[PDB]
Design a protein around this ligand. Structure first.
Ligand SMILES: [Zn+2]
Ligand SMILES: [Zn+2]
Lengths: 127, 142
RNA sequence: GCGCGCGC
RNA sequence: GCGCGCGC
C-alpha cells in the first residue's frame, strides 16, 4: 500500500499523465469517480448518453468519456443528483507509483485507500 | 424466439459499423468463449503486443494480445492462444448483428438468434493444414 | 456503460 | 479479457 499522494493516473493506452489518485472518490462504495475539475481537460464526452435499461435513485448516465489524446474509452459520465462526475473503469487508469507503473484489475484492490464521495464536501471544494 | 441460419447473420463493429465478419465463422470454446475461425478475419482487427494478464493457468490455452477494430479501434476482446493456435475471442456487446430482420445488438452470446457450433481443434487444424498440391505450380497438382 | 462474485 | 450471475 502507498500513501495516495504518491499515486498518479495515466491513460492505459497512450500513457500520458491525466490525473492523481488523490482525486478519486467512491460512489455507493463501488463506482470510482474523479472529482478534480481540471480532470475535464483530459477527456472528451460523447454527444449522446450511454443507454442503461434501469432507473437508478440518485443518478442517470451521461456520455462516454475517452482520452482526449488517444481516444481510449475510460468509462462514462455519471450525473449524480444533477452533478456530472466522470466514472472511471479501473483497467483504463495505469497507476504510476513509487514501485513503477501498475495495471490494477479491480478498484476494490488498488494499493491505496480512496474516500467515499461526500456531496456536501464536493460543494465546499467547488463553490 | 425465431432462429436464423448462421449464414444470414453478418457481424459489424458496434462502433464504426463496418462489415467485419459472418455468423457462420463463429465457434464456441469450452461452450462459452466465442471465437471467429475464418483466417481472413485477421485483416479486420489489431492486436496490442502486450498480452492480457490473467493470474490463472489454463490447461489448453493462454491469453494473447487485446483485439480491436482495425478501423476505429473499438475493443472487441482478446486473442486466445489455444493449443498453440491464435483465435480471436469476441465479446458479444462489441458486435452488431445484421440479420434478415434488421440489425441487432445482443448483450449475451447465450441469447443470439442463431446457433454457434462447438470449436473442434482437429477440424480447425485440418482445414488449415497446407495442402501444397492445391497450388498450380506444385508437382503434386493435377 | 461502471462495480462485485464465480468460472475460463 | 471472455463467459455466467447479481448490483448500480
Ligand atoms: Zn490516451
Ligand atoms: Zn469499428
Amino acid at each position: 500500500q502507498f500513501p495516495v499522494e504518491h499515486v498518479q493516473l495515466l491513460c492505459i493506452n497512450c500513457m500520458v499523465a491525466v490525473g492523481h489518485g488523490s482525486d478519486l472518490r467512491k460512489v455507493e462504495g463501488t463506482h470510482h469517480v474523479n472529482v478534480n475539475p481540471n480532470f475535464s481537460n483530459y477527456y472528451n464526452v460523447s454527444r449522446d448518453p450511454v443507454v442503461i435499461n434501469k432507473v437508478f435513485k440518485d443518478w442517470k448516465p451521461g456520455g462516454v468519456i475517452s482520452c482526449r489524446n488517444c481516444g481510449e474509452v475510460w468509462g462514462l459520465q455519471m450525473i449524480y443528483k444533477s452533478v456530472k462526475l466522470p466514472v472511471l473503469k479501473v483497467r483504463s487508469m495505469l497507476l504510476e507509483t513509487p514501485q513503477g507503473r501498475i495495471q490494477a484489475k479491480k478498484w476494490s484492490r488498488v494499493p491505496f485507500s480512496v474516500p467515499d464521495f461526500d456531496f456536501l464536501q464536493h460543494c465546499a471544494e467547488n463553490l
